[PDB]
Each structure stands twice: as structure tokens, then as C-alpha cells.
Write a protein that binds this ligand. Structure first.
Ligand code: HEM
Ligand SMILES: *[C@@H]1O[C@H](CO)[C@@H](O[C@@H]2O[C@H](CO)[C@@H](O[C@H]3O[C@H](CO)[C@@H](O)[C@H](O)[C@@H]3O)[C@H](O)[C@H]2NC(C)=O)[C@H](O)[C@H]1NC(C)=O
Ligand SMILES: *[C@@H]1O[C@H](CO)[C@@H](O[C@@H]2O[C@H](CO)[C@@H](O[C@H]3O[C@H](CO)[C@@H](O)[C@H](O)[C@@H]3O)[C@H](O)[C@H]2NC(C)=O)[C@H](O)[C@H]1NC(C)=O
Ligand SMILES: *[C@@H]1O[C@H](CO)[C@@H](O[C@@H]2O[C@H](CO)[C@@H](O)[C@H](O)[C@H]2NC(C)=O)[C@H](O)[C@H]1NC(C)=O
Ligand SMILES: *[C@@H]1O[C@H](CO)[C@@H](O[C@@H]2O[C@H](CO)[C@@H](O)[C@H](O)[C@H]2NC(C)=O)[C@H](O)[C@H]1NC(C)=O
Ligand code: SHA
Ligand code: CA
Length: 595
């Protein structure tokens, strides 16, 4: 008895069987268990959920119920005390480009999305929550502590709505509350193509048999494409500058316009698909609209996989890479490919990697204009700066020439995210990503820090002094202990990120284990992994290994001067070579001799 059945409210169809292409929803990857890894199903639970009432209510909800004998500290107070800092000087990662951060967010968005609860196409709930901070039903407000500046100017709380959950919607019961993953668990470029058949089609250009994705018709970038605008009104990207009135972009994933540099990455990817389809039609004139689409799509998925596993992961995991992701040995049908609930919090390490400004660079990589460098907070949901202020190139050069923020125990998340975050629903630039992440841990029913330490076979400190040794920091450990009273209560997000970094990596031991495990699984459990014998031909594989993020830029923008290794810190002009010197993807193994 597993309650095993609930496969209700989720989209279902029938398995093409022997079809050489992924489904849009991720169904039919695993043959014996077709829904494994599919969009719109519960996040997997590596450990049982820990809720206040065993079942659904998050810790902190009832002001008199403790966690292990103690009150859990307010999310925003953990924010003020531990996460914040004032001095941006000295914070840059000396050996990671701004693209390091940016790629993490692309990968993250391909793997997981736990959307908020609605129950309001119009309702006094999406206003009884913001207006009066009344806790109730899915309103779980972030209360301001005594002495928080935002009291004086903003109000009593920050509104926060609980994440969606499987089986039904309305008030629910029985089992413990399981959050939804609205995206496919496979590294499959679902952020470009969509996770629903509904959206996947909208995204496509079905006016012509060329297998192209829809492109914006109102605006161009030197004869290069943009993403289509979104139908949706109200539009937050419009609300950001009512004079300019530029809507958000329409991509395979809904978060695409969250910040300008993410919209930039999205548009590079769309551009690549269309390029692939054209080139492909040249070699194979007989091919379908659909065949063009799927074949370009499959190449792109292979790209996202290769860069992620070859270029990106080795420099997050560092020396722990070998211990968690051993060399590939083939598809294993017994490996569970689903994204775990804790992964969506472990992968939030990238929040501590966001710097406070974004730069635009000209063709010599010099400050583009008099306002080249901008505070990150003016760029949330900002599309007008792309369309009406130089297009994509000045913004991509910044990604190569500037650095990520480095995680630092005394300087965690920049005030740009910690004080001035803009939420697409509400109206001010006054939210706090750090406090939200913490509130969300509780919302998702996360075991505490020592549960995960235990899970990863690592020591579980019980005392101040134990915590000082693990964190290798007396002061940090003291603050944590004063807010939390015992390490068993430390929220996973703040606990995992407070750990010193492993050698040659950018996360600590606990994070390396959680991430490493997840990635091993999503590679080993993927029937369509690129190296899986029979998915691509040997000659096709040889062609795919030559792919690089540098090339992507050469083929898709008017940048002519790029680094070879784009994720490490690169200085212009020494570290920058001409595009000619950069290996090209050879599409000739994709030829199809008729007779
Ligand atoms: C300026 C850059 C970024 C902004 C503004 C941003 C903003 C946000 C916001 C508002 C959320 C939702 C919080 C919640 O409701 O719980 C979120 C979630 C998340 N973020 Fe970030 N983020 C950024 C960069 C990154 C980076 C660099 C990474 C990783 C390298 C990352 C990983 C994640 C992940 C994994 C989630 C959970 C998504 C889910 O499963 O629902 N983000 N981010
Ligand atoms: C800045 O970061 C660089 C990013 O990797 C780093 O250089 C790299 O160092 C690692 C080992 O420390 C090596 O990487 C690779 O190792 C072998 C080559 O012997 C390959 O077979 C592996 O697949 C893997 O890619 C490289 O030697 C080197 N990687 C690159 C891309 O050049 C620098 O050391 C960092 N700078 C400093 C001083 O911290
Ligand atoms: C809202 O978005 C507006 C862009 O649609 C933006 O206004 C634009 O920005 C500057 C003025 O600050 C102008 O840029 C330059 O234009 C000419 C060159 O042709 C110069 O002579 C000007 O002096 C100026 O430097 C844009 O022309 C201007 N466009 C319009 C129609 O106003 C606003 O800054 C945005 N506001 C916010 C709050 O972000
Ligand atoms: C769908 O694809 C078609 C075919 O490329 C696009 O229409 C072309 O647009 C360019 C620029 O205007 C012109 O060469 C022609 O007007 C069209 N070509 C042909 C073959 O007629 C169209 O823009 C795409 N539709 C969308 C919404 O992206
Ligand atoms: C595929 O991965 C599965 C899941 O981890 C492996 O299942 C294991 O089977 C081995 C023996 O082959 C046992 O030693 C492990 O204890 C099993 N794991 C669990 C917890 O079930 C399996 O090793 C892999 N299959 C192959 C043949 O590579
Ligand atoms: O940018 C985001 N994540 O990185 C994001 C933005 C809005 C809503 C949910 C999200 O996950
Ligand atoms: Ca996916």
C-alpha cells in the first residue's frame, strides 16, 4: 500500500513508441514507467516532508508551535542578520565570468518550476494578503521584524503565496502536501520549446514548412531575430516603463523576462534553433516542417547537455565532481530521473552569485554610452532596454567581460535582490529574494540542515563549537545559533550556502552532494542522453563535441571577438580570439541519401 495511484489533474497521452524524438511533456522517456520525469507531477521526495502538523502546515505558521522545542526565526530577520551587506567592493569572482551565473539560471529553469497557487482570476485574496498581511489559506506573509527599515516605508509584511500542489487544488488533505514541477525533469531545452503541447505549438512558426520558431514581427536586432512579444495584459514589463510600453517576451518558460540578461540568453537559444533549421533544410531539401523542427530541437537539447556537463558542472562541483558524477556508462532504466524537492533549493546557490550591476559594452568592449553600467534592480522584467537601447550584442559582451559575484560568508546576497526585488504580480521594487527562499523552504516542508548532512554521510554538529568547525567561521556560526537555537532547525538554503567551498568548486560539501546526486540521476535516467548509444550516430557525436558557448555567440550575434573558454574570467583583448579560430559545429553527418 503506497497510495500509489494519484495521477489525476496532469496532462496525459499515448506513447509514440520507437519515435526518435522526446515528447514535449517528458512522458514516454522511461518505457516501463511512462510518467517518470514528466512535467506537471510532484517533485520527488528523497526524504519525508516535515510539516508543522505532519501534513501540510509549514513551520512558523502557528506562532506557538515549535520546531524541536524552539520558535523558528522570521525569514526576513535571518535575512537582515546573516544575508545582507553594504560594501560591493571586493566581491567579484576573480575566476568566473558573468555567464557562469547566467548559465546556472538557464539550467535551473530547464529542470524545475514550482508555480504559486492562484484561486483568483479576480479575488479579494490576492489583496487581503498584500493589504492586511492576514495569514490564511495560501497567504503565508513574510512579517517584518522590529527595527526593519521596510516597516517605516513599505508596511507590515511582504506578501507571499504558497506553492502549487499535486492531485487537486482547493483545500486539501490526506497525504502530505507535495509541490508540483511544471517543467520536465530532463535536460532537454524545455525552456526554449515549452513543457506543454499547448504552448509548444504557439511558439512554433506553422505559417511555413521550414520548422522555424515564431519570431517578433514588430522589432529587429540588425536583421537578427527577437523573441515574440506576449499577448498577456496586464504586462509587468510594460508597467516598468509606461512611456515605452514594451511587453515581456514569449518563450518556452514563463520566467524568461525576469531579468534582462536572462531574456538575452533565451534569444540566443531561439536564434540557434532557427539557424539550425535553415542549415538543415539546405542539406536535406525533402525534409518536413516537423522533421526540421524535431531535428533542430534534438541538436539544441544536446547542446544544453554538453555545455552543462562538460563546461559548467566541473567548475561548480570542483574536486567533488568525480565522487558524485562518475564517467557515463549507459542509460540505466532503474534510475529515477525526477527532480527532488530539495534540489530546487540547493540550486538556489546561484542567488549568491548575482552582482549588483549590469554592463553594456561596445565593439572594443568599452563602456557603451554614458549609462553603460546599471543597477540590477532596474532590469527586472525590463525588455525595453533590449529593443530600444542597442539590442543583444552590447549585453552579451558584458557576459564575457564581467565577472560573477563570489559567494562570501560575510557578503551573501546583494541588496539589489535582497531589498529591491520586483515581483511580477505586485507593484514595488521592494521584495527580498533571500527571505522568500527561506519562507519557501518552510512552504515546501524541508527537513533541516542536519537531516541533509546525515543524508550525505557528513557530520551533524549539535553545538556552537561543532557548527564553528563545519562552517570554519566563529561569527557566522554564532549568529546562526542565536537565531535558530540548534543546527537541527537551520533552513537548508541558508545552511547549505553558509559552508565553505570545496577545492576548485563554488559550493560546499553538502551542496556538492545534493547537486551531484541530482545531476548523476538526470543523466543516467535519460533514455535520450546524447551519449546514449543509438540516439545520435558516432559521426554525429564527433560533431557535437566541437560545440562551445563561444561558437553559439559567433553564429548568432555580430560579435567577432570571443574567449575560447567562456566561463572563466577573461580579459579583453588578450584572452579574446577571432571567431575564425573557434571550432564550428559540422552539420554534414546529418545528411540523408534517398536512393
Ligand atoms: C538576477 C538573477 C536572478 C533572479 C532575479 C532570480 C529570481 C528568482 C525568484 C523570484 C525565484 C522564485 C522564488 C520563490 O518564489 O520561491 C527564484 C527561484 C529559483 N532560482 Fe533564482 N533568480 C536569479 C538567478 C538565479 C541563478 C543564477 C540560479 C542558479 C544558478 C537560480 C536558481 C533558482 C532556482 C533553482 C529556483 C527555484 C525555481 C523553482 O523550482 O520553482 N536563480 N529565482
Ligand atoms: C580559472 O579556471 C580555470 C577553469 O578550468 C582553471 O583552469 C583549468 O584547470 C583544470 C584543473 O585545475 C584543468 O581542467 C580540465 O583538466 C583536463 C586537462 O588536463 C581535462 O582533460 C578535463 O576534461 C578538464 O577540462 C585545466 O588545466 C584548466 N581548464 C581549462 C578549461 O583551461 C584555472 O586554473 C583557473 N585559474 C586560477 C589560477 O584559479
Ligand atoms: C522609459 O523608456 C524610454 C525609452 O523608450 C526612456 O526614454 C529614452 O531615454 C533617453 C532619455 O533619457 C533618450 O535617449 C537619447 O535620445 C536622443 C538621441 O536620439 C538624445 O537627443 C537624448 O538626449 C537622449 O540622450 C531616448 O530618446 C528616450 N526616449 C523617449 C521617447 O523618451 C526613459 O528613460 C525610460 N524611463 C524610465 C523610468 O526608465
Ligand atoms: C514564419 O516564417 C516565415 C518564412 O520565413 C516568415 O515570413 C518571412 O518573413 C521575411 C521577412 O518579412 C520575408 O522574407 C517574407 O515576408 C517571409 N518569407 C516568405 C518565404 O514568404 C514569418 O515572419 C514567420 N512568422 C512568424 C510569426 O514568425
Ligand atoms: C542502475 O542503477 C540502479 C539504481 O541505483 C542500480 O541498482 C542496484 O543494483 C546493484 C547491483 O547491480 C546493487 O548493488 C544496488 O544496491 C542497487 N541499488 C538499489 C538501491 O536498488 C544498478 O546498479 C544499475 N544497473 C546496472 C546493471 O548498471
Ligand atoms: O527568475 C526566476 N527564477 O530564477 C523566477 C522568476 C519568477 C517566478 C519564478 C522564478 O523561478
Ligand atoms: Ca527540462
Amino acid at each position: 500500500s503506497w497510495e500509489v495511484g494519484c495521477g489525476a489533474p496532469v496532462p496525459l497521452v499515448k506513447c509514440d513508441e520507437n519515435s526518435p524524438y522526446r515528447t514535449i511533456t517528458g512522458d514516454c522517456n522511461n518505457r516501463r514507467s511512462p510518467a517518470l520525469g514528466a512535467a506537471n507531477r510532484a517533485l520527488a521526495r528523497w526524504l519525508p516532508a516535515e510539516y508543522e502538523d505532519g501534513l501540510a502546515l509549514p513551520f512558523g505558521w502557528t506562532q506557538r508551535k515549535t520546531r524541536n522545542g524552539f520558535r523558528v526565526p522570521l525569514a526576513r530577520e535571518v535575512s537582515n542578520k546573516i544575508v545582507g551587506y553594504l560594501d560591493e567592493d571586493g566581491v567579484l569572482d576573480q575566476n568566473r565570468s558573468l555567464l557562469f551565473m547566467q548559465w546556472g539560471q538557464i539550467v535551473d529553469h530547464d529542470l524545475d518550476f514550482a508555480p504559486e497557487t492562484e484561486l483568483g482570476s479576480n479575488e479579494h485574496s490576492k489583496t487581503q494578503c498584500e493589504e492586511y498581511c492576514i495569514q490564511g489559506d495560501n497567504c503565508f506573509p513574510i512579517m517584518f521584524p522590529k527595527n526593519d527599515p521596510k516597516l517605516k516605508t513599505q508596511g507590515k509584511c511582504m506578501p507571499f503565496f504558497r506553492a502549487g500542489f499535486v492531485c487537486p487544488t482547493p483545500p486539501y488533505q490526506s497525504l502530505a502536501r507535495e509541490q508540483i514541477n511544471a517543467v520536465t525533469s530532463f535536460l532537454d531545452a524545455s525552456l526554449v520549446y515549452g513543457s506543454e503541447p499547448s504552448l509548444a505549438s504557439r511558439l512554433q512558426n506553422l505559417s511555413s514548412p521550414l520548422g522555424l520558431m515564431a519570431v517578433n514581427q514588430e522589432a529587429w536586432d540588425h536583421g537578427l531575430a527577437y523573441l515574440p512579444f506576449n499577448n498577456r495584459k496586464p504586462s509587468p514589463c510594460e508597467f516598468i516603463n509606461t512611456t515605452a510600453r514594451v511587453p515581456c517576451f514569449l518563450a518556452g518558460d514563463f520566467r524568461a523576462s525576469e531579468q534582462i540578461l536572462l531574456a538575452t540568453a533565451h534569444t540566443l537559444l531561439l536564434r540557434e534553433h532557427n539557424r539550425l533549421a535553415r542549415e538543415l533544410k539546405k542539406l536535406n531539401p525533402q525534409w518536413d516542417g516537423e522533421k526540421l523542427y524535431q531535428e533542430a530541437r534534438k541538436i539544441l537539447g544536446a547542446f544544453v547537455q554538453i555545455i552543462t556537463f562538460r563546461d559548467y558542472l566541473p567548475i561548480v562541483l570542483g574536486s567533488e565532481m568525480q565522487k558524485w558524477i562518475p564517467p557515463y556508462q549507459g542509460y540505466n532504466n532503474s534510475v529515477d530521473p525526477r527532480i527532488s524537492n530539495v534540489f530546487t533549493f540547493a540550486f538556489r546557490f546561484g542567488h549568491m552569485e548575482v552582482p549588483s550591476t549590469v554592463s553594456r559594452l561596445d565593439e572594443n568592449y568599452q563602456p557603451w554610452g554614458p549609462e553603460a553600467e546599471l543597477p540590477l534592480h532596474t532590469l527586472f522584467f525590463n525588455t525595453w532596454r533590449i529593443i530600444k537601447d542597442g539590442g543583444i550584442d552590447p549585453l552579451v559582451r558584458g557576459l564575457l567581460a564581467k565577472k560573477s559575484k563570489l559567494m562570501n560568508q560575510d557578503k551573501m546576497v546583494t541588496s539589489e535582490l535582497r531589498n529591491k526585488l520586483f515581483q511580477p504580480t505586485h507593484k514595488i521594487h521592494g521584495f527580498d529574494l533571500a527571505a522568500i527562499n527561506l519562507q519557501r523552504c518552510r512552504d515546501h516542508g524541508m527537513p533541516g540542515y542536519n537531516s541533509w548532512r546525515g543524508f550525505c554521510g557528513l557530520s551533524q554538529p549539535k553545538t556552537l563549537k561543532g557548527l564553528q568547525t563545519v562552517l570554519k567561521n566563529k561569527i557566522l556560526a554564532k549568529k546562526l545559533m542565536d537565531l535558530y537555537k540548534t543546527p537541527d532547525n537551520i533552513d537548508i538554503w541558508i545552511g547549505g550556502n553558509a559552508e565553505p567551498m570545496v577545492e576548485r568548486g563554488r559550493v560546499g560539501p553538502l551542496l556538492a552532494c545534493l547537486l551531484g546526486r541530482q545531476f548523476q540521476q538526470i543523466r543516467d535516467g535519460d533514455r535520450f542522453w546524447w551519449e546514449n548509444p543509438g540516439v545520435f550516430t558516432e559521426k554525429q557525436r564527433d560533431s557535437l563535441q566541437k560545440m562551445s558557448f563561444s561558437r553559439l555567440i559567433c553564429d548568432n550575434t555580430h560579435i567577432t571577438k570571443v574567449p575560447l573558454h567562456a566561463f572563466q574570467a577573461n580579459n579583453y583583448p588578450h584572452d579574446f580570439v577571432d571567431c575564425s579560430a573557434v571550432d564550428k559545429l559540422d552539420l554534414s553527418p546529418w545528411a540523408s541519401r534517398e536512393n
